[PDB]
A paper describes a structure:
We report the structural basis for the role of two lacototripeptides, Val‐Pro‐Pro and Ile‐Pro‐Pro, in domain‐specific inhibition of ACE using X‐ray crystallography and kinetic analysis. The lactotripeptides have preference for nACE due to altered polar interactions distal to the catalytic zinc ion. Elucidating the mechanism of binding and domain selectivity of these peptides also provides important insights into the functional roles of ACE.
Numbering used by the authors: 1 to 130, 135 to 613
The structure:
Amino acid sequence: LDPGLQPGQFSADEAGAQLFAQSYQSSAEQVLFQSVAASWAHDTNITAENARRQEEAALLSQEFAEAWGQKAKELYEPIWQQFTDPQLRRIIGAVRTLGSANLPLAKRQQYNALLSQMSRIYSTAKVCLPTCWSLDPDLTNILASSRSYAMLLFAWEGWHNAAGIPLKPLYEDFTALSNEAYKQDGFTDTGAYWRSWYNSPTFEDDLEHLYQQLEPLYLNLHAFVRRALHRRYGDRYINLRGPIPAHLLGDMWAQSWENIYDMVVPFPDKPNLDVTSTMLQQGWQATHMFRVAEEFFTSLELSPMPPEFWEGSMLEKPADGREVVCHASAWDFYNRKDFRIKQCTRVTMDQLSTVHHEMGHIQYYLQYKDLPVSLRRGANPGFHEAIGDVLALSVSTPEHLHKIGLLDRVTNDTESDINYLLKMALEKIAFLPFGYLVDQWRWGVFSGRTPPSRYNFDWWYLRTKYQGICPPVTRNETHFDAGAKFHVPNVTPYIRYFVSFVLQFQFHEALCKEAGYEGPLHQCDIYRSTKAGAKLRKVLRAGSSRPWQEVLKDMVGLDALDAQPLLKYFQLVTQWLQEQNQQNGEVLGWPEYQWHPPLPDNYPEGIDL
Ligand SMILES: *[C@@H]1O[C@H](CO[C@@H]2O[C@@H](C)[C@@H](O)[C@@H](O)[C@@H]2O)[C@@H](O)[C@H](O)[C@H]1NC(C)=O
Ligand SMILES: *[C@@H]1O[C@H](CO[C@@H]2O[C@@H](C)[C@@H](O)[C@@H](O)[C@@H]2O)[C@@H](O)[C@H](O)[C@H]1NC(C)=O
Ligand SMILES: *[C@@H]1O[C@H](CO)[C@@H](O)[C@H](O)[C@H]1NC(C)=O
Ligand SMILES: [Cl-]
Ligand SMILES: [Mg+2]
Ligand SMILES: [Zn+2]
């Protein structure tokens, strides 16, 4: 390790630890920069050479973590836990947690290479024909817009087989090394480490209690959408008492259903709330979508995006033949200057939402960039994922869309309310079972409850139990369908999105009240409210300097996750769906749990290109 980056000498007392922490932070800045820069060069240009460079930067990061953690142990291990300063307790407790730096050199190298290779496999996989299709944009476009049973099947099967099958042996090796690493920090397994970020003894029980409250809304949305699908695909491919085939819901993972709005919309002669065709008619591009998102942030007196953001970001998929990680992300270089998005932006209404999601992450980085590096994080990971989604709730209202020239016609009547709440339910309520189940699967893999011999059997148990879907072709343990979802090979934790989907409605309700808005919660738009801005700004500036339960209390009046704001927002549509399903004679749930659809005639030969 460079002489400049090694730990010096400090006294073995709380006062010494104060000096240790400040010195620790001043070094960490330079090591973080080199890591993030190498990661950017690879994720925007996947090559064997750029992987080698990123692995070399990762190794340096591990060498730094080891040197500083050992010093914390040497000086503090028997005393830091009784330190008078809560904040200090927080940094020393982190510094003595070595993670992958606990591995011996040869295994550290093995671990870093596995990360590179899993990322490559996912982001470069394609589906070839009898020139090959990428996930983004080509397969994503098919799953969103095709109403051909056989074309949808070709895309879902091609993707799952191409991405998932080769990942399995690498994912087994990654799991074992990750657990060996975190075990030496005193965690039972890696999942116990990930859950410890919420600092709550009752986390899994509290999540289980939230889901019991939300499940009836999901079951009612599921039954009404199954019926709408039946009226299009017919009795051969839809069983009104069984699971829905996993490729027909608008999305490769069936995780949100807004792309099948046209098939589900209750009252089709009210205003058309999907504005994608208007964006295309008006000639919107990626640069327009980013500028319009920026202007929502400045309307609240939050920060614009700096020159370095515009000069360095990647806002469209490269047209030069580079392979890239298309799944969107926001980057803090840890130098208080360089902040960037990398998104393969397409011109659609759901992508405008995604732009706001990413720009939320940037705004958090701008607001806490002056805190010590160890505290440049969200209050918990759910808070970081929620910020942009909250502003997108306001943007998507019919009233806001009118203000920005995306929806000419204005109506305020009960049918128009039901259309809007149903469209928002397809986006937010359909996701809840998926946002809950992903880390239940992964926690069972890290604990050993799910060995490699049961990866796919236990994935499909969960997908059917929670989402009420079935795979549309037969699967066995050579398939690794969890591996065909970004966050699994890219080692990104998922329970943050279930947390975020609950939190965002808590935050929206609080900001709408601070704005002085007095109408129905689902019609609030906080645009141009400088008072809502100031309240959100207090959250962002806090970083991880204070317990999330306290930050939440200051913001919304309660110190806990709470489903009541979500239920209040959806109340009218919750009642309407329950009455429609009863009048229609639906069965709620999927009692014919063994059912799978038949194959199309001639499959796969009878599809044009
Ligand atoms: C598992 O499946 C492999 C791929 O075969 C395809 O998927 C299976 C589920 C069947 O539908 C089969 O008709 C398909 O062509 C098979 O190659 C394999 O031999 C099956 N068994 C094992 C152990 O992989
Ligand atoms: C839409 O209408 C909501 C309901 O308004 C109340 O009831 C209707 C029947 C009328 O009598 C009206 O004058 C009442 O105030 C309002 O709460 C809501 O603000 C309106 N929202 C928008 C965006 O126009
Ligand atoms: C992609 O990275 C390679 C290194 O493997 C480099 O030669 C090439 O110039 C890069 N391309 C771009 C467009 O940055
Ligand atoms: Cl998380
Ligand atoms: Mg979508
Ligand atoms: Zn995010």
